[PDB]
């Protein structure tokens with residue numbers, strides 16, 4: 143019947159946007175859903191009809207320029223452990239008189255896995271990124287995560303992680319606890335999961351995506367004459383590239399028929415870019431998904447969320463990866479023939495312009511984009527995700 147579903151995430155657009163429509167659907171079907179979220183995102187999540195349950199997070203918030211995420215994986219996992227340790231008691235208290243029938247959580251929310259186990263309720267991981275295949279432990283986890291860190295920093299990380307887990311009655315190795323959920327819905331296109339053939343289907347179910355108007359974000363109107371709209375965005379975090387943005391202005395400025403929407407983040411000011419020609423507009427934040435329904439090209443850092451939205455609208459990409467997993471994703475995008483990967487250094491005005499002109503006229507990039515878009519249309523929709531979640535509800 144109508145149950146209590148509690149969703150858990152952090153204040154990061156890439157970890158909240160991919161599941162908003164699913165939360166909205168669960169509310170619409172009559173479930174009472176709470177959304178554990180840091181205060182800066184309360185409004186953003188309240189837009190789904192779920193009630194925000196607030197808690198203080200120590201992770202970098204996207205609104206504050208004084209903060210930034212690290213570029214390396216090991217520092218990020220450090221951040222997630224620290225945040226989890228201080229966030230768990232707050233969330234335990236907040237939910238002490240109302241324990242949900244099911245727990246939904248983004249991959250970053252360790253407290254949700256701990257509270258799920260201590261409560262005895264099911265937990266569903268919602269992954270806005272790729273998941274472990276069978277053989278992940280021997281192919282990447284041991285060679286690239288564990289074996290390169292037999293350091294005092296590594297040993298400290300594991301000692302604190304396992305002390306925290308064992309403090310909470312959990313005996314799993316920290317790495318299986320973090321990287322191997324018992325049940326997960328994968329919100330990315332199968333076409334972009336490495337070794338999708340070897341992903342345990344009894345654990346993971348690809349639901350691809352379904353995106354609706356984030357009407358809260360407002361709209362963007364195509365200006366008159368703008369035949370080819372190109373959006374430039376390096377995301378929410380790794381956005382401090384003023385030299386690259388100036389190269390974008392010089393690649394598309396005054397190009398007849400092209401219009402450039404340049405999203406520069408909040409650590410670069412428009413003044414840093416010089417005089418702007420009439421066909422280029424600059425923002426520190428854009429309604430990105432609305433612009434991707436109208437864009438002919440997307441110059442992206444290849445973050446998972448932006449890539450998902452672009453593929454969902456079948457817009458060709460120039461992938462300029464900035465940090466962490468983006469490089470791998472850029473490579474996959476190029477490996478699928480829907481994007482060109484450029485390093486930030488080599489992204490000069492002339493090569494940006496000729497790469498964009500090439501991508502938008504290439505019939506083969508369009509047909510591989512439509513194929514991926516149809517595959518995503520066929521891994522169910524939001525209603526299949528809500529069905530699988532409801533299926534995890536007990537009696």
Ligand SMILES: O=c1ccn([C@@H]2O[C@H](COP(=O)(O)OP(=O)(O)O[C@H]3O[C@H](CO)[C@@H](O)[C@H](O)[C@H]3O)[C@@H](O)[C@H]2O)c(=O)[nH]1
Pocket residue numbers: 154155156157159160211218375376377378379380405426427428429430431443444445446447448449451466
């Ligand atoms: O002007 C803008 C800029 C971005 N977005 C949206 O913001 C979300 C971000 O998507 P994604 O590109 O996947 O996230 P990023 O900001 O690129 O990356 C983060 O992903 C990791 C998750 O913790 C961390 O390393 C840091 O947050 C950072 O790397 C997407 O839904 C975009 O549509 C907008 O709506 N308007």
